[PDB]
Design a protein around this ligand. Structure first.
Ligand SMILES: Nc1nc2c(ncn2[C@@H]2O[C@H](COP(=O)(O)OP(=O)(O)NP(=O)(O)O)[C@@H](O)[C@H]2O)c(=O)[nH]1
Ligand SMILES: CC(C)n1ncnc1-c1cn2c(n1)-c1ccc(O[C@@H](C)C(N)=O)cc1OCC2
Ligand SMILES: [Mg+2]
Lengths: 883, 168
């Protein structure tokens, strides 16, 4: 127990709360979670230690690669005859001397082949005696590795060189892939053998539900702290029976003693059956809720609830419509000071347990034992192509249910079929279980739709997880990690398949595990998810290995930035000339604060090392909440080839959760375009929300806003691109200005970002256009207006007529990009529905995500949706986008 | 310490690669590996002080000519080398001498005209008198060399670092 006294200390630092707050939890599910989840840790640490040196190095440095080795046609054409010019750097002298070795090689070469070519660049025709074969053949064996110059990424896996994002990005940008050569011992000697240290708490009638044959009856006894109680049985968001409420008793008399008789049959309660409670006040009609609570009818051991229970209710949000809140948390309030409603459930004089699959498939026979034309099958295909928010009429409900045995031909209609099942029927829930058991596999992006709030059934969610661990790559997983972490709240239990999946994968890929921690620590300021994420972060830190040491340095570093911004906002802040640069430079030069920001991995990117500070550029911005513009050094020995000033914006006041979702969709929109031929270079800079409202923003060097470029006012934007890109580079910089503009214009119209002005739009000296500060999206209370300065640059240099051949092709880029996103409308809408539980201001109800359906014209055909965009573009730009 | 980025420019197959590795590895090579851009470093004390010689073996395939405009901005010492057995390289040396002065916008710059493959006298097409002819024309110093016998290999790079100090 002496080693556990040391590990438990640093674990509580990263979580933000001591570990003892979980050992004193009387909940049996909490203790069983911490006990059984260690099986996921044991299976993970034993997977990281199969091979002695490489398995640990592969974990800490996973190959950041693309999802498919197949290169797009226009990306392959960027290569010289299908070959890439890579630069191999080798250190020879012990005094840190550099020697480059350029070589042309095929793009689809494994790292072992480029190493062997660098061997030829070091030998040529050298010395070899007939006893010196294995002396030099050992060079061609497993002896050397490869590393990106400037970053901490390693080419450890035998994937093609094009798959790696760094090499892939060098092909896009047209840059030299500089790779430093190392040996296996140079990297393996920095990773110890962490033996699995299990904690101290890792020690070693009952009839079925379908034999009860009674009516569900729940009694409310009393309460603490004219009103009544709204009680409802729900399965996610759909109700099973009519909302049964109690008598309207007066205030200050929290007594009822009424067995609420529900219309649901006890053997018909699904596995994910939930009870929804709320208190409404009566003062025409006067009905307004105040407090609400949610309890699942079955606990984590598949047993029916029985006996008395004390439920602590939750405060209603800012905007709640219905009296009862079905989208609850399935838990009691741990505030111990809010109104506590007491209940009493039915007894049955036995432990009623939900039946296993054996009885479910056995009773599935009793449903059939108790007693195809082509024009019909084409309609089911037209239903799967509709967005997940398209209202399925009742006539379409029975169409999919009467043809449930045919839907195996089109497995993409499964999310549509699940909404066509009366889950309040013990016969339909048994037949649907057998269909999901043998359902064909679907795409990982389509399986995520079955993990949101609309599909709370464990058999449905278990299918989606089995479609991820068999078809979801680590690239798309790190891409969709924010939405996958977000849907953990929709799980009604602590230990489940989705948690065991995201834990084992995060414990086997440290690049995934890094963002797996910060996306969970950023939710600790909310107690409704603190217990679930606290137990999950405890299990992660218990077996995350050596990275716990580096992870605690980032927490201490980030915490040293939150308090300073609080002292600069709550205190002082009176004068912004010397006071803005007095206390600011005094804390950054303080000894105890300097070492807090020295030699720790960047939270925005674990491969970036934030080394020495450069206080000469560190300042406080004059924007909202006065962010902190910070600057670091790159302690990499090859820092000359990559960036040298790691610049990060620390936004304290404003919430940075709206930016992450926008900066992520822009990356997803860019990948969809690059995979179809649209070379619209988007700039999705890094952004990570921390804690309550603080967060980090990745800064791009040599970037200036539209207002930053001026010399009175004039159209000097075209001159700035002329002055910085002379010769034949001007023709390429103007093209970069048009392709990035068409992307950042057709994307903001689909998102609906706030009114973009000259400070929202920034341009680089290279000529790339990109937007920033996505604080308001999907808003309604157009954003990218084609100003005069844009057409002066887009339409060559025509100072008068802007509608020329250059602008004529600008519309065609937007049309191909608009229709491309429309073809993937189901993917983006699913990404917004998985973020509804994040409590974002513009992501509260489905009326906001429906704004995507209208801006994409998902109710019209392909050509009719094209004229919609041309109409709205010609309306925003008065006479700009004529037919 | 003593920054000296030496650059070896010239045509194809004139001996830039054989002369470069002869200065460090001190072994003559016989393969024809078309160089693109390789870097070599060697600490020398033959000069009156120390020297951090950063040697760059450049390409001569004319397909990497876009890389010429790069190392001609960072290097402070060049070696216009050609093969006495190849008049094609001899009549293309001045093109390298014009691009260097055009990039830096200077009247002169430390560079030494090297005539390689001098051991192949039975196949020499550019005699010695034509070598010093281009020396006075380009206002540089002429020096024949031969990587096969290691003739004036150290003197070629050492006389280059002597013009850098006498430049100023
Ligand atoms: N006889 C002889 N051969 C030489 C001499 N120097 C170079 N060579 C030969 O010339 C050939 C090509 O020259 P190399 O060493 O590749 O020099 P380079 O000018 O850098 N070649 P490239 O520009 O094509 O990369 C090789 O066969 C090499 O052995 C020399 O002094 N004497
Ligand atoms: C308002 C703001 C703090 N903000 N809010 C939410 N996101 C941002 C945000 C996002 N970026 C930026 N700011 C940004 C700013 C300035 C900048 O260069 C400076 C030198 C300049 N004055 O030209 C480079 C930048 O590039 C990264 C992208
Ligand atoms: Mg060469």
């Amino acid at each position: 127990n002496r080693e556990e006294k040391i590990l438990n200390r640093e674990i509580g630092f990263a979580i933000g709360m001591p570990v003892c707050e979980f050992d004193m939890v009387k909940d049996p599910e909490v203790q069983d979670f911490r006990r059984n989840i260690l099986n996921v840790c044991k299976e993970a640490v034993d997977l990281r230690d199969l091979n002695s040196p490489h398995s640990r190095a592969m974990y800490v440095y996973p190959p950041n690669v693309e999802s498919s080795p197949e290169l797009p046609k226009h990306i392959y054409n960027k290569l010289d005859k299908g070959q890439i010019i890579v630069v191999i750097w080798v250190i020879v002298s012990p005094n840190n001397d550099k020697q480059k070795y350029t070589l042309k090689i095929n793009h689809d070469c494994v790292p072992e082949q480029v190493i062997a070519e660098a061997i030829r660049k070091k030998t040529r025709s050298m010395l070899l005696s007939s006893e010196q074969l294995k002396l030099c053949v050992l060079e061609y064996q497993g002896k050397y590795i490869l590393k990106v110059c400037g970053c901490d990424e390693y080419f450890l896996e035998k994937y093609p060189l094009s798959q790696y994002k760094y090499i892939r990005s060098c092909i896009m940008l047209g840059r030299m892939p500089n790779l430093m050569l190392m040996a296996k011992e140079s990297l393996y000697s920095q990773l110890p053998m962490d033996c699995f240290t299990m904690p101290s708490y890792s020690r070693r009638s009952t009839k079925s539900l379908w034999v009860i044959n009674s009516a569900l009856r729940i009694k409310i006894l009393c309460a603490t702290y004219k009103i009544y109680v709204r009680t409802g049985i729900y399965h996610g968001g759909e109700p099973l029976c009519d909302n049964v409420n109690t008598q309207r008793v007066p205030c200050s008399n929290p007594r009822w003693n009424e067995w609420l008789n529900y219309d649901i049959y006890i053997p018909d309660l699904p596995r994910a059956a939930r009870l929804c409670l709320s208190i409404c006040s009566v003062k025409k009609e006067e009905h307004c809720p105040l407090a609400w609570g949610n309890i699942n009818l079955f606990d984590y051991t598949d047993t029916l609830v029985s006996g008395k229970m004390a439920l602590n209710l939750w405060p209603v949000p800012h905007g709640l419509e219905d009296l009862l809140n079905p989208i609850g948390v399935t838990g009691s309030n741990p505030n111990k000071e809010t109104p506590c409603l007491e209940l009493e459930f039915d007894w049955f004089s036995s432990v009623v347990k939900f039946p296993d699959m054996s009885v479910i498939e056995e009773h599935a026979n009793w449903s059939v034992s108790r007693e195809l034309r082509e024009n019909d099958k084409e309609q089911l295909k037209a239903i799967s192509t509709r967005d997940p928010l398209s209202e399925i009429t009742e006539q379409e409900k029975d169409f999919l249910w009467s043809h449930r045995h045919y839907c195996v031909t089109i497995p993409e209609i499964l999310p549509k079929l699940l909404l066509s099942v009366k889950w309040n029927s013990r016969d339909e829930v048994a037949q649907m279980y057998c269909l999901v058991k043998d359902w064909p596999p679907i795409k990982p992006e389509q399986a995520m739709e079955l993990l949101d709030c609309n599909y709370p059934d464990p058999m449905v969610r278990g299918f989606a997880v089995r479609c991820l661990e068999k078809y979801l790559t680590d690239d798309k997983l790190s891409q969709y990690l924010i939405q996958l972490v977000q849907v953990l709240k929709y799980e009604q239990y602590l230990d489940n398949l989705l948690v065991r999946f995201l834990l084992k994968k995060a414990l086997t890929n440290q690049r995934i595990g890094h963002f797996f921690f910060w996306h969970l620590k950023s939710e600790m300021h909310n107690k409704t998810v603190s217990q679930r994420f606290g137990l999950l972060l405890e299990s992660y830190c218990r077996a995350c290995g050596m990275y716990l040491k580096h992870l605690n340095r980032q927490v201490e570093a980030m915490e040293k930035l939150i308090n300073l911004t609080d002292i600069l906002k709550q205190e002082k802040k009176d004068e912004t000339q010397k006071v803005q640069m007095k206390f600011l430079v005094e804390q950054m030069r303080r000894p105890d604060f300097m070492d807090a920001l020295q030699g720790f991995l960047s939270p925005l990117n674990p491969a970036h090392q934030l080394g020495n500070l450069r206080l000469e550029e560190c300042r406080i911005m004059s924007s909202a909440k006065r962010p902190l513009w910070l600057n670091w050094e790159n302690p990499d020995i090859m820092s000359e080839l990559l960036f040298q000033n790691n610049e990060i914006i620390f936004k304290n006041g404003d919430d940075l959760r709206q930016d992450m979702l926008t900066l992520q969709i822009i990356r997803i929109m860019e990948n969809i375009w690059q995979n179809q031929g649209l070379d619209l270079r988007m700039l999705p800079y890094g952004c990570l929300s921390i804690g309550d409202c603080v967060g980090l923003i990745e800064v791009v060097r040599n970037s200036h806003t539209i207002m930053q470029i001026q010399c009175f006012n004039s159209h000097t934007l075209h001159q700035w691109l002329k002055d910085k890109n002379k010769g034949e580079i001007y023709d390429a910089a103007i093209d970069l200005f048009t392709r990035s503009c068409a992307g950042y214009c057709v994307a903001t119209f689909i998102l609906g970002i706030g009114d973009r002005h000259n400070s929202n739009i920034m341009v680089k000296d290279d000529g790339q256009l990109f937007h920033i500060d996505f604080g308001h999206f999907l808003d309604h209370k157009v954003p990218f207006v084609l100003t005069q300065d844009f057409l002066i640059v887009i339409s060559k240099g025509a100072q008068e007529c802007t509608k020329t051949r250059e602008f004529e092709r600008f519309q065609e880029m937007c049309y191909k990009a608009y229709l491309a996103i429309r073809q993937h409308a189901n993917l983006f809408i699913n990404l917004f529905s998985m973020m509804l539980g994040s409590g974002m201001p513009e992501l509260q109800s489905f009326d906001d995500i429906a704004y995507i359906r209208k801006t994409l014209a998902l109710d019209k055909t392909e050509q009719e949706a094209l004229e919609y965009f041309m109409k709205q573009m010609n309306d925003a730009h008065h006479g700009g986008w004529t037919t | 310490q003593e920054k000296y980025r030496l650059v070896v420019v010239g045509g194809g197959g004139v001996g830039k690669s054989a002369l470069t590795i002869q200065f460090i590895a001190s072994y003559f090579v016989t393969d024809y590996d078309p160089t693109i851009e390789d870097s070599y470093t060697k600490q020398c004390v033959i000069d009156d002080r120390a020297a951090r010689l950063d040697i760059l073996d450049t390409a001569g395939q004319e397909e990497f000519g876009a890389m010429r405009e790069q190392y001609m901005r960072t290097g402070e010492g060049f070696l216009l080398v050609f093969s006495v057995t190849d008049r094609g390289s001899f009549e293309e040396i001045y093109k390298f001498q014009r691009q260097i002065l055009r990039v830096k916008d200077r009247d002169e710059f430390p560079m030494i005209l090297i005539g390689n493959k001098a051991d192949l006298d039975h196949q020499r097409q550019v005699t010695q008198e034509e070598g010093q002819q281009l020396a006075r024309q380009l206002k540089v110093t002429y020096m024949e060399a031969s990587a096969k016998i290691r003739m004036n290999v150290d003197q070629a790079f050492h006389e280059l670092v002597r013009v850098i100090r006498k430049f100023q």
